[PDB]
């Protein structure tokens, strides 16, 4: 209802989807995704349209819509 479904594209083009509220700070998504890869979150960078997602960003603040895509990149050196 205020939820939207997001596809998180990981580095192997595998996908995990999250249903989150438009107002949810996106840190939970990052922490859940990094936990499921068995990797440190700070080894990862979560991008929405190339732009880094902060712990306090929300889907609404970022302008996310239904089925929008987050890409998970390896963090840079």
């Amino acid at each position: 209802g205020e939820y939207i479904k997001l596809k998180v594209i990981g580095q192997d083009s595998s996908e995990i989807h999250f249903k989150v509220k438009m107002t949810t700070h996106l840190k939970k998504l990052k922490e859940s995704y990094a936990q499921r890869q068995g990797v440190p979150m700070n080894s990862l960078r979560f991008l929405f349209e190339g732009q880094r997602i902060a712990d306090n960003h929300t889907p609404k603040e970022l302008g996310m819509e239904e089925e929008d895509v987050i890409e998970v990149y390896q963090e840079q050196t």
């Binding site: 995990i16 989807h17 999250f18 249903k19 509220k21 949810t24 998504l29």
Partner: peptide
């Protein structure tokens, strides 16, 4: 390769 949906709590 199956679909994976996680529901997150606010």
């Amino acid at each position: 390769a199956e679909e994976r949906i996680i529901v997150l709590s606010d």
